[PDB]
Each structure stands twice: as structure tokens, then as C-alpha cells.
Symmetry: D2
Subunit: 214 residues, 4 copies
């Protein structure tokens, strides 16, 4: 079922700072190379009044290169699939919650996403769209009460330089029992490859690689 080439369909509905929106996406990736590319269209709530970058890491750890010696929680989870929940705690008190329900129909991953952001200061970098990109990162993966937890120290590079910090916690729940991995890492980088004026259209790329550290 998980082939060397898979397609991806997604719908996100969300509210940030009380602003409602819908974004749909279509793309493709190489699960075994840990790469994926997606084309995202704002369907409702254009133009977004917040930094598009807060959304991009919510737009599937199936797209991560897992070595033999590390059990692949994500790939083992299919065909049944899995869901995740995430909190994003920004250093200025902005908080987001997000979830994705991931299903497999043929060679296509369907992603049903909800995103909610609250308490962004009105003159902070998110509401004033001062973000350039996410720096690369390393997710710390560990089992807690029988499900996979990922913690990340994430940072947005700001216009003018310097960084806006965010702590991620993701809980990943396979819909069937799998071989649980030991403590390990997933390196990430995520890049907006192109966008129009108000990010109504966005081409998004991720590379991810699992490893056991030093």
C-alpha cells in the first residue's frame, strides 16, 4: 500500500485570532526518501491576516526516511492509518492546537485537519506577518503510555533577524497496534518553495530523516 510514490489530498479548517479559513492542498511525495511537495489554495478567509508559516508544519510523518534499526510507527500503521494531535506553545503566549486524521485510499493519503490559534499579541510577528521561515529542527520521539510522542524546539526566523520560538508536542496514535520504536530523532526542514501576494497559493516542501543521535 505505501509505495515509493504516493499522492496527498488535504482540507484544513481553522480559526486564528477569531479569523475563520479553509485551505485545500494536493501533492506528492517519496515516503522512503522522506520528501513531499504540496500545492495549497486558500478556499475561505482570504486574505489571511496572520503569518502563513504557523500553518505549514500542520499541512504526516509517513514522509520521513526511517532506517532499518528504527521501527517505523507511521508506515506500520497502514492500511488502517493513524491520527495526531499537536499543541504549539509560542514564547509570547500564542497557542495553537491542531489535529490530522490520516487515511489511505489507493496511493493517496487523505488529511482531515483542524487548526486553532489563540492569544497572538496584536503587534507580535504572527499578526504583523514578520516571519521568513522555520529553521530546520530535530523532533525527539519517545513512547508515553503506549503512544508515540514528539517534542520539538522550533524557531521562526524573523524579518530583521533573530527568532520567534515555539515548543511543539505531538501525540501520534496508530489505529492498530504496531512495533513501538525506542527513543529516537527525526530531523526536519520545511520550505515555502513559492507563493503569491497573500499566500492564496503556496508550494510547500519538507525533508525528514529519522536517526538515533550520537
Amino acid at each position: 500500500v505505501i509505495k515509493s510514490d504516493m499522492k496527498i489530498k488535504l482540507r484544513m479548517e481553522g480559526t486564528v485570532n477569531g479569523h475563520k479559513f479553509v485551505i485545500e492542498g494536493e501533492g506528492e511525495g517519496k515516503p522512503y526518501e522522506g520528501t513531499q511537495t504540496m500545492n495549497l489554495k486558500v478556499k475561505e478567509g482570504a486574505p489571511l491576516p496572520f503569518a502563513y508559516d504557523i500553518l505549514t508544519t500542520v499541512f504526516n510523518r509517513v514522509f520521513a526516511k526511517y532506517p532499518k534499526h528504527i521501527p517505523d510507527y507511521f508506515k506500520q500503521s497502514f492500511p488502517e492509518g493513524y491520527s495526531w494531535e499537536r499543541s504549539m506553545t509560542f514564547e509570547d503566549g500564542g497557542i495553537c492546537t491542531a489535529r490530522n486524521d490520516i487515511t489511505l485510499e489507493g496511493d493517496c493519503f487523505f488529511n482531515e485537519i483542524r487548526f486553532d490559534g489563540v492569544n497572538f499579541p496584536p503587534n507580535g510577528p504572527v499578526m504583523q506577518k514578520k516571519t521568513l521561515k522555520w529553521e530546520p529542527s530535530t523532533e525527539k520521539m519517545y513512547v508515553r503510555d503506549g503512544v508515540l510522542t514528539g517534542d520539538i524546539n522550533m524557531a521562526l526566523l524573523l524579518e530583521g533577524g533573530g527568532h520567534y520560538r515555539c515548543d511543539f508536542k505531538t501525540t501520534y496514535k496508530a489505529k492498530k497496534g504496531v512495533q513501538l520504536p525506542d527513543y529516537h530523532f527525526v530531523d526536519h526542514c520545511i520550505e515555502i518553495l513559492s507563493h503569491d501576494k497573500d499566500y492564496n497559493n503556496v508550494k510547500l516542501y519538507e525533508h525528514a530523516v529519522a536517526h538515533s543521535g550520537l
Copy 2:
């Protein structure tokens, strides 16, 4: 417009641990006495698989007794009204986001509520419904970048005794400029007066009183 007796209508839509639900409520309160009572019906997602108590403080600081010497951000905000956003950070990593858009039509407050909870441990008190009540509390109210912020150290009393701690941050945004108060407190207590087996029906009561501390 804000009389000694007002009615309240609400709809909450939410997702906790991936479980979708809708709850509607009707009730009444005394804004100047800082009291209110509400009758809540689960409309979708019965029976709730999580502790109903995580919802109750999301089900309007108009219902708080404000003394003369403290400017009433909430009552001054009408007829135009106000909205709030809240993060609830539980000590075991459970996080909720919530928002309420409050409008005034005649003597009735309409409440449009969204609630989302993530990362509740499956064997924690919320997913195992081990909560008895919220302890009383004191909200710390202060202006930050021109809007009212409230911080609360909240605690749920547990079955077996001892407490489950939650930190609230609420940002309150009047839809028109008002007299901003100085740093002050709002004492709260919130009580489920009655409920059926699975909290399909709930009668809920709050008392709230603003003060300037010692």
C-alpha cells in the same frame, strides 16, 4: 441594554481527543450581582468520553459584580459586545483552546463558542472522568498592548482527593474602545448544580466578584 436580569443563549462546537460534539445552552443571570445559571444539552457526540468539567468555564465576564472604583471593561463593551480567546494548559500536557463571540440582541447574550482539546493522556483524569469540580479561583486582570488579559491558577478536585492543575490565559477584546481598568482581581466559583448519567443535561451556576486585593 444590560439590565438587572438578562437571558443567555449559547452553542459550543468542539473536538477533544478527536471526539466531535455540539452543546447548546439557555439560561439567565444577574449581571450586577455577578451570578448566572444555565441549562446545557449535548446535541451531538453523546455520550462525551471526557470529563465534562473541562467545558464549564468556557460556557462571559459580564456576569461579575464590579465595584464603582474598578472600570467594567465587559459592561462598557455593549451594545457592540466583545469576544475572548483562552488557552488552558493542564499540568499533564493536555491543552485546550477556546473562543467566545458575545453579541447582545434585546435582553439576550448570544455566545458562539469553539473548544478544542489535545494531548490528554489516555489514563489521565480527563479521559478517565475522575474530576469532581473546579475549586474556587481568583483571575488576575491586567491590560497588555491595549486589551484585557486574565490569568488563573485553576484546579480540578479529583476522585480520591488531590488536584489536577490548569493555567488559564484569556484575552478579552471589546468591539469598541472603553475605560481600561487598572490591575485587579475577579473571584470565581462555578458549580454543576445537577446533571443526568452522561452529562447529556447539566444545570450550571457561576458567582464572580471583582476586587482590588489587600
Copy 3:
């Protein structure tokens, strides 16, 4: 042993931002009225390069008015006495740890204090001495694994107005078993009554009152 009038002797040794100091104090209070006054002298590390206010709440919950219906963990702890540990988490990442070992010799409380502060931004209000006072507060008191825990949402009023937030957690350990109270509150206010140029000399006052909330 705990009379209506008691004396207080203290020595604090500490390091903030790498700056070492020693402060000694002598004063007096009314345990049953929940009041105390103290005279503090900087003995080493004058002039302090940080906001003196970060120290003042570390300079004994014996000085709190406890009503009959709330068991007094502190007063019950003597003659043997008690110790406490505290973390102070400031909203800009400044963190302090502090401890006090409290003994009773005659009508005098001896206080052996250690205070350590790290990660204060060099252009933040603590290192630029922009604090005016602590706002009043309400400490939430609860038992956790057999010892009394206090949580406080504290705020320093800043020069220019607006607030610098700090979260306190104190663990209070009686040196003998006592009647553990139920969940309750202690209202505080703390005031620098007078000081010289660089706070080499400071007269400090606290009022504290325990209550059961609404």
C-alpha cells in the same frame, strides 16, 4: 511558642546574572494578624545591579491570618519549624530558585535563605531596574504527595505602566506531621515602605490572610 508578637532574623546569600550578594534583615510581626515588617541591609555585592523587588517575597507563611475553619500548616509546624523551596518563572525566561530553612529560638524566627536567578535578559525590566512594586496576589494552597504546595500568578508593575508576570511554585515542608488543610487561598500584599538610593537599606511590609474563596 508562637506568641502575638515575634521577632525575625534573616541572612540571604544569592547570585543573580552571576552577581554575588549577602543581605541580612531584622524585624517583627503579628503572626495572628498576618503582618510583618523587616529592615534589610546589603552586606556584600552593593550596589545590586538588578531589581530589588525580585528578592522581597523570598525575605514565612507563619505571618498569615488563618481562620479557625482552615488548618494552619505553618503554626502547627513549630516548635520544630519548616522549610520551603520556590521556583519563580518570569514571562521573559528569567528563572529564580529560592529556599528558606525557618527555625524558632525563643520569640525569634531565624531564616537561612539561598536565592539564585538566571537568564534575565540584559535589557529586561529586572537588569534595567524598571520595577515599581508587586501587585497584590492570591496564593492557591493544596496538598500534593503529603506536602503543602502554593501556586501564585504574580505581577510586577513597571515604570511606564503595564506588568511583568511571574509564576511562583512553593513547596512547604513541616519538620513534623501536622493537620493538612484542604484546598484554600492566602491573599498577600507586599510593600517596600522605604529604601535608600541603591536599596542598601530597605524597610519591607507584608499583609497575608487565608480564606476559602467564594
Copy 4:
């Protein structure tokens, strides 16, 4: 001054849970290979009543392999040297503060260390010595207001399996201006190579490597 082979002398004084101790160490490392080994003796407060592992990462980022393309804040700081401050926020509310003042005399780094830990639950893994090791980690390094900040998601592996999480923030201050690096990573692993019954004697090893991520 920073040769391919350097010696290390250290003294830590600290208090955890009110327990006072002094630990001295002597060792050696390869700054350009990012390796170091140290022999630590408890001089006061034997036997330690807490998990020795909370101390080991406080026992100098000079011992990290820095590639050409990343400015070496640490090595550039000598001969004048640098100091750091650290907060360690454990997931059960245990908090430590630590600092190190690092000087260079000949081929020897001198380390003047203070460590303070508070609010460790009495039946938690630190006070019940249930820790096996620190998992490897990746420190996120970024400049904030002109000094180097490092954030780490750290985890102790527990007896019985599963993990105890700790968030590190270190502020690193060179005693002279240097070439500030861009956002980057330092991979770490730290290992107790050997110890006696109560960790009165400990041989400690670290490997560290700076990189720019994916």
C-alpha cells in the same frame, strides 16, 4: 591557547531538596574533536540523596566539533573566556538553576559551578534515583539580544523504561565580543563510563558536534 589537548579542573557547590554538597573534578578533552572525560569526587554531602544524572550536563561548549562554516562562539571567547547560566525545567515541576564561570590558565579550563534544584516530588524519579542515563540530544543555538542562547529537549531514560523530560535554556556570555554564529545545532551525548555504589566517584564522557541541520 586552545590546543588539540586541554585539561579541565572544576568545583561545583549546590543544594538539591535542601541537601548541600560539593563535587570536585579533574579531566582532559579534545576541543577540536568535541570530546572530554572527567573524574568527579563528592567532597561534601555524601551520599547524595538524588539522581546523580541531574548534575552531569552542568559538569563547557569549548568541547564541541565546530565546522569551518559555523562561527565558534566558545573558542573565539578565549583567552578571556566566558560564563553560562542554565535553567532546567523538569516535566514534574522540579527546577534547577546552574552557572559556570570558565577561565583559561595555561592548557587548563577552570570551572566555578553553582547548582540549585527545588520542588522535586519526594516520590519522583530524581529523589528515588530511578534514572539510567540522558538520551542523546540536539541543542538549538541562536543569538537573542547579542548573546548565544541554547534550548534543549532533554530526556532521562527511567528504570522500568519510558522517559522523564527536561527543557534546558542556557545563556552563554563571552567576556569579549566575538563573531556571532547564525542559527545552528549542537548534537550531544553524555555517558557515565563508571561509578562506585553512591556515585562518590564517577568517570564522565561527552561527545558534541555542531551542524546546520538538513
